[PDB]
Amino acid sequence: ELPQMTQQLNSDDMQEQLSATVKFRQILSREHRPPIDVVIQAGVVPRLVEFMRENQPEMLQLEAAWALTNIASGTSAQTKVVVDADAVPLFIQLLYTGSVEVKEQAIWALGNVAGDSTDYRDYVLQCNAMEPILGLFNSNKPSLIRTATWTLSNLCRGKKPQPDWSVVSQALPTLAKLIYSMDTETLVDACWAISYLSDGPQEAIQAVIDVRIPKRLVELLSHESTLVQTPALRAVGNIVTGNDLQTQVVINAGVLPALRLLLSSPKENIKKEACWTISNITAGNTEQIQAVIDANLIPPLVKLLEVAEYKTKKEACWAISNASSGGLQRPDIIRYLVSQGCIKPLCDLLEIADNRIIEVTLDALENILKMGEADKEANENADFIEKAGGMEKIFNCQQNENDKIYEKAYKIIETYFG
């Protein structure tokens, strides 16, 4: 029915133009394998682009943008056809119309184009889409805001390369309000967008802090939906990869009790990134390590270090190891860590873990040994390590091919097990 659809689409009559356009939309609207290629091969894409022009019938603009939306929803080669037909400037132009139906269709299409690659993401930005897109969040229609939020997230997504910060940072005040939304779907993509923006340099992290986003993010960690918790925790986790001052902001927002709740999540990936987030907090100063302890975060971490899946165990190891670094300044930190039974789970990790985690682990063990040695000139810990079977593990680590694990395992054996 395609050669007749094509001729009908090229008719000078206006209502059969619409009739054919609708028909093209329906066949392109198939969840699995829409006939995008045969539609493209009909050569109708430029004609559909013409129908989005200013002062075309509103219904015709809607149907054409919808058809082009689904062509752009396909492969990159198929999306390229839409882009090469100069559809993007018209998509953006449609955002300025007064029809919420047309505007949501246009912003949906831009979501597919921007979500294709960093090239098309930046291309959409280059066509100055940010200003009309930000204006969409003042709409009376939840679905329009919902779709615009997803498209906005795609404009912030990607680190290779990152989007122009001077452009995407303009969306920060909007996103700051959007995480106070009642719509769950809006909440999800808004948090994803923030996680992308906060996935970068400390200058980017600071900007997120400056618009007072962290406080509401922490609240969203206890949201009923894991679809909200996941990007929220990711965003929070990204922020605490910054310096101690930036991390303290998240702490003051009450992230530590929230992280305690996430450590018992049924979803493993939430438990892992909870461990990851905590680890980048125990990577801070003595007072921040102490705050983690005071939030009763160590006992579930120890158990996860003992029992959880491997890639969760790694992050739990990071957290306890980073916390042990505060033992030189405050020996009670180590004394508490040992008291909570962290020595054996650390020791058992030496035979299974990767060379980076092995080093993480050896770092933790030596810190425990240093404190135990000092707590005599004022080795129980070395005795606990031997009985945990750890003295043997560390000795075996002297046959490790990597330089820094060898000499570290060597010095541990030489200093505390001579």
Binding site: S73, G158, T241
Partner: peptide, 19 residues
């Protein structure tokens, strides 16, 4: 010191079909 576990920069296409 801080650390990221991801480090893997994957620009998977993020698209949605409207049906």
């Amino acid at each position: 010191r801080k650390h990221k576990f991801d480090t893997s920069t994957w620009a998977l296409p993020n698209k949605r079909r409207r049906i």
